[PDB]
């Protein structure tokens, strides 16, 4: 009803809010005020990964830190071998209309996604020599926007019809169902632990929820416009997320609060993708000025600057030995930066 | 590179470069068809402009993709009716077809919509129509103005005349001027003049000739490139 | 169920020419480089010819050079092996043989079942030292390689590769680079060594695993195999 219903809530957002200013005893500004910064980053390029022919969409880097698979809105899945620049894989995907990417931890399998509801999952290691079709997701009303594998036999995807899922690759059914958003979510990114991962949709909202039982644990806001990207802290007690406001920000999980705003006066143009060091003290995000810039973490001041692309940034990843950083822009490139 | 490399990685090396041959082939197969996006709202009739064509000549759905040959031009057309999403969040997708192909039914000026009561449909469709032609995205994409159900709506202005909707239209009230009115209003949204082009076309003719002019829109555009491709502009 | 099929053998006279058929099925045999070996009676392995995928790179041993040519018919699914002024040092068992090369690949993990040519009548050296020993069910040996250069590359890989072959049967692959296990093989068997010195090791013995065990080169191209070390009882 309307009366002792949609109101009485209303008092526990007054709740939670009162919970949430009782615990901000100070701020991450003032602990880390006496801290020595990080200086000038200075990267430069080492490898440019040429071969794809429309704008790159996603990529995703291997467990062994060497071999990368990008997706390009061409028709085209490409395994590359970054340490030669040399293509192992091209995939053709029955659907061009490709908006993501993710590569099995174990190195076996790769997925991909888009405009078509389906989530397509290939065999890398066939005894016939070549790369085949495994397994066709489908069950999601909206376009996939995010895929990331939990092992050989599990997925979580998120959908544009508001919706998460994790599947049964072996049965091809959906397993897990998570349902509390308003607009479509954008992003995903898995906890350490695997226990745990975190979704932002385009209602300016994050949620965190429990792989095993299924319930949303805890949601944050505080951004003004769309979530476009998600990541995990190392020690995966933390996340960061980027907006079509212009500005990164830093979740705590523990404390249930927003903890730093990482945004500039002269940066106006939203955020695509971000990424952390393998310390976790280095931010690194993508933005539609074709720029990527690199934040220090602790005290939210601009680092560095990498400026290679002629057009948009639209993904970013950090090898699992935080060796190299690698960009993908709405180009035909792919950039190693060291 | 060069001699300081194994045998393995010579062929590995190899197989590196047969894949971008394959790829170069692919590409260059890919940049000789036509892509063409369709759009409409309601029951504007892109049933009936997909039937046109119904040779291959080669959960819920997201997108459509239909094939056709005519005149030895390849066009594949690409229906987005089913996503229910956030449109601004994938139309950037579509930035570099060669054109947008726009059904708008006449005969869908007297009814109004269904959940808004109040709601004119030919009103719903400009606003879909101003709001795609002044997308950031199509700056310079030419758009294809399918204007379809003439012969229901020669009928429906002799009952109702069209006053219902523009309220300021001071005319014969005949199908000759009444249409050639709808045009002028569908083409004065047009705030790009000097970068895109609007065909429009009477499609509630029967015959295949429907085809044969995208043939035609298709051709001057592809004309259009070139001339900004070789430096004229 | 990857199958090859090779045809074409039989009794010769000193001089002339033959040719022989190896016929591919259940893989992808366009993306496979190809190999021809040769046995002879009672003796050890030796590479006679490669061709590559796309047959942009062809190497033959030194000692048919000239007088061997390979091809392949990749529409057709075959491989050609054409000899000609056959000596009475020709007459072998000869096997086909499919790699492939990337980054993290198998190659040699495929045989065929060979077929018989009768005629009526610096490279690198690979030793085994080491032609027979007794074996027990339960009990666990080692087989030495021995090679007269270093096989590791400046790049991490130490390229020695290790095949057994039963009695009555073709040699399968055990291990690849020295330290990587074949698909489908127990793991009972490990390999491991320095640059220039090599051990195998089949921990727990069966009614499996007696044959003669080779090890095999990929630095050079010219491909070099031990004598083989026979393992009886």
């Known amino acids: 009803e309307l009366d002792q219903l949609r109101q009485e809530a209303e008092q526990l957002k007054n709740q939670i809010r009162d919970a949430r200013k009782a615990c901000a005893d100070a701020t991450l500004s003032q602990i880390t005020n006496n801290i020595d910064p990080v200086g000038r980053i200075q990267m430069r390029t080492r490898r440019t990964l040429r071969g794809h022919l429309a704008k790159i969409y996603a990529m995703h880097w291997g467990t062994d830190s060497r071999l990368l698979v990008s997706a390009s809105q061409d028709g085209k899945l490409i395994i590359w071998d970054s340490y030669t620049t040399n293509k192992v894989h091209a995939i053709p995907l029955r659907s061009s209309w490709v908006m993501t990417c993710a590569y099995a931890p174990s190195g076996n399998y790769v997925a991909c996604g888009g405009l078509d509801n389906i989530c397509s999952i290939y065999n890398l290691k066939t005894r016939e020599g070549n790369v085949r079709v495994s397994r066709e997701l489908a069950g999601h009303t909206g376009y996939l926007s995010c895929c990331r594998f939990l092992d050989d036999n599990q997925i979580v995807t998120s959908s544009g019809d508001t919706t998460c899922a994790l599947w049964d690759i072996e049965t091809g059914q959906q397993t897990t169902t998570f349902t509390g958003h308003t607009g479509d979510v954008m992003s995903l990114s898995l906890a350490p632990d695997t226990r745990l991962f975190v979704s932002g949709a385009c209602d300016a909202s994050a949620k965190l929820w429990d792989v095993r039982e299924g319930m949303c644990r805890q949601t944050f806001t505080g951004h003004e416009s769309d979530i476009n990207a998600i990541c995990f802290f190392p020690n995966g007690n933390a996340f960061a997320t980027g907006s079509d406001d212009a500005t990164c920000r830093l979740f705590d999980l523990r404390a249930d609060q927003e903890l730093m705003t990482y945004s500039h006066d002269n940066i106006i143009c939203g955020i695509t993708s971000v990424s952390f060091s393998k310390s976790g003290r280095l931010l690194l995000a993508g933005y539609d000025d074709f720029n990527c810039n690199v934040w220090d973490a602790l005290k939210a001041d601009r680092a560095g600057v990498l400026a290679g692309h002629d057009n948009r940034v639209s993904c970013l990843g950090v090898t699992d030995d935080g060796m190299a950083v690698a960009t993908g822009s709405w180009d035909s490139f792919l950039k190693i930066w060291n | 590179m060069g001699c300081t490399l194994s045998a393995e990685d010579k062929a590995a090396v190899e197989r590196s470069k047969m894949i971008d041959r394959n790829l170069r082939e692919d590409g260059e197969k890919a940049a000789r068809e036509v892509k063409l996006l369709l759009l409409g709202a309601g029951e504007s009739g892109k049933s009936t402009i997909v039937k046109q064509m119904k040779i291959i000549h080669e959960k819920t759905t997201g997108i459509v993709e239909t094939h056709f040959t005519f005149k030895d031009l390849h066009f594949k057309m690409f229906d987005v009716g089913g996503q229910r999403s956030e449109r601004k969040k994938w139309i950037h997708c579509f930035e570099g077809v060669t054109a947008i192909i726009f059904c708008v039914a006449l005969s869908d000026y007297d009814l109004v919509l269904a959940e808004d009561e109040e709601m004119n449909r030919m009103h719903e469709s400009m606003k879909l129509f101003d709001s795609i032609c002044n997308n950031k995205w199509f700056t310079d994409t030419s758009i294809i103005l399918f204007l379809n159900k003439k012969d229901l709506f020669e009928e429906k202005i002799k009952k109702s005349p069209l006053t219902i909707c523009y309220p300021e239209y001071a005319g014969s009230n005949t199908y000759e001027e009444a249409a050639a009115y709808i045009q002028c209003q569908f083409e004065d949204l047009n705030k790009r003049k000097d970068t895109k082009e609007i065909y429009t076309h009477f499609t509630c003719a029967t015959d295949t000739k429907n085809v044969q002019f995208v043939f035609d829109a298709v051709t001057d555009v592809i004309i259009k490139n070139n001339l900004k491709d070789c430096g004229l502009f | 169920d990857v199958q090859l099929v090779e045809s074409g053998g039989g009794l010769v006279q000193p001089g002339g020419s033959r040719k022989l058929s190896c016929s591919a099925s259940?893989?992808?045999?366009?993306?496979?480089?190809m190999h021809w070996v040769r046995q002879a009676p009672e003796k050890g392995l030796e590479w006679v010819a490669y061709?590559?995928?796309?047959?942009?790179?062809?190497y033959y041993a030194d000692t048919v050079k000239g007088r061997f040519t390979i091809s392949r018919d990749d529409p057709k699914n075959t491989l050609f092996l054409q000899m000609t002024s056959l000596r009475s040092e020709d007459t072998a068992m000869y096997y086909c043989?499919?790699?492939?090369?990337?980054?993290?690949?198998?190659?040699?993990?495929?045989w065929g079942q060979g077929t018989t040519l009768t005629v009526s009548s610096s490279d690198i050296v690979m030793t085994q030292a080491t032609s027979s020993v007794p074996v027990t069910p339960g009990e666990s040996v080692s087989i030495s390689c021995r090679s007269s250069?270093?096989?590791?590359?400046?790049?991490?890989?130490?390229?020695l590769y290790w095949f057994l072959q039963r009695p009555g049967q073709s040699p399968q692959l055990l291990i690849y680079?020295?330290?990587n296990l074949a698909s489908g093989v127990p793991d009972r068997f490990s390999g491991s060594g320095s640059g220039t010195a090599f051990t195998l090791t089949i921990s727990r013995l069966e009614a499996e695993d007696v044959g003669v065990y080779y090890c095999?080169?990929?630095?050079?191209?010219?491909?070099?195999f031990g004598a083989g070390t026979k393992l009886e009882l």
């Open positions: 043989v499919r790699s492939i090369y990337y980054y993290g690949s198998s190659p040699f993990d495929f």
């Open positions: 259940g893989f992808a045999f366009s993306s496979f480089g």
């Open positions: 061709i590559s995928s796309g047959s942009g790179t062809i």
């Open positions: 250069k270093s096989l590791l590359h400046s790049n991490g890989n130490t390229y």
């Open positions: 680079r020295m330290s």
């Open positions: 095999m080169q990929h630095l050079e191209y010219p491909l070099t």
